[PDB]
Design a binder for this molecule. Structure first.
Ligand SMILES: OC[C@@H]1C=CCCN1c1ncnc2[nH]ccc12
Ligand SMILES: [Cl-]
Length: 167
């Protein structure tokens, strides 16, 4: 039993809700919140910009030190950093950005990072400003993640389409 509330159950381990991931994380304080990161951990917009703003830019400060030490992430890769005031940890995961021409096949590799954590609050990877089809992103999530994932979908219209079209 966990403290996530109001989710629809898609499979044994995947749940979905219309919610603002920032507001969700502040309420639940999950062990892990997933960020829709880029390889440079430059949290300018989309989910990443919103999560970083909610940390008063502390996420960006920590991320800049991470990059200065380790260099960029790989597309499909991840790193674990602090969750600041939002969660214990933030799993920064880089899905392919279709608007940069990155290979959508890497979306499965991106979701595989979730399997290293027993429970996560997450967005759909490569959705929104990353330019992938969110219906596809949900399909890959369900077919790749085996741990317990609570998916927050900000847009109410998109959420209804995701549910009504889910196979
Ligand atoms: O697929 C990512 C998704 C789709 C469109 C825009 C960003 N996205 C978000 N998903 C969940 N919570 C969010 N809070 C702020 C943004 C946000
Ligand atoms: Cl985004």
């Amino acid at each position: 039993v966990n403290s996530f509330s109001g989710y629809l159950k898609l499979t044994d381990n995947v749940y979905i809700k219309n919610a603002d991931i920032v507001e969700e994380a502040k309420k639940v304080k999950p062990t892990v919140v997933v960020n829709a990161a880029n390889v440079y951990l430059k949290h300018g917009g989309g989910v990443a910009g919103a999560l970083n703003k909610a940390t008063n830019n502390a996420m960006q400060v920590e991320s800049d030190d991470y990059i200065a030490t380790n260099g960029p992430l790989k597309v499909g890769g991840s790193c674990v950093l602090s969750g600041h005031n939002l969660a214990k940890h933030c799993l920064h995961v880089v899905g392919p950005n279709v608007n940069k021409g990155e290979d959508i096949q890497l979306l499965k590799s991106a979701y595989e990072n979730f399997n290293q954590h027993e429970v996560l609050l997450a967005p759909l990877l490569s959705a929104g400003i990353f330019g992938a089809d969110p219906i596809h992103s949900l399909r890959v999530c369900v077919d790749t993640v085996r741990t317990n994932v609570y998916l927050a979908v900000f847009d109410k219209n998109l959420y209804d389409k995701l549910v009504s079209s889910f196979l």
